[PDB]
Design a protein around this ligand. Structure first.
Ligand SMILES: [Zn+2]
Ligand SMILES: [Zn+2]
Ligand SMILES: [Zn+2]
Length: 85
DNA sequence: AGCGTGGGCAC
DNA sequence: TGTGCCCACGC
């Protein structure tokens, strides 16, 4: 509720100053972080990190039940539930 | 499946 | 003033 977004259409607010200014990038279209492999620009450093794994094939997250690996923790999370029948 | 991408947040 | 996870959607 403290920090807020000045643009007309939006009615959003952020507790941390950083999240307000991160959101503002949606409006300005700023994409600060670039992939030195395919040159594609991204809005967030964390999304650039996971994107790079699509190129390298790095998959740090293994399923506890079957061991299948994933580049992202949420992909693994989405996967694990399939072992429930 | 593969994976873009914003919000909540701890640090 | 960032960095970097977890979470959630969406397609
Ligand atoms: Zn806004
Ligand atoms: Zn790339
Ligand atoms: Zn599995």
């Amino acid at each position: 509720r403290p920090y807020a977004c000045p643009v007309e259409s939006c009615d959003r607010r952020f507790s941390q100053s950083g999240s307000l200014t991160r959101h503002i990038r949606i409006h300005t279209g700023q994409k600060p972080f670039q992939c030195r492999i395919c040159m594609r620009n991204f809005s967030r450093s964390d999304h650039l990190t996971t994107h790079i794994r699509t190129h390298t094939g790095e998959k740090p997250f293994a399923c506890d039940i079957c061991g299948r690996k994933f580049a992202r923790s949420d992909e693994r999370k989405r996967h694990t539930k399939i072992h429930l029948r």
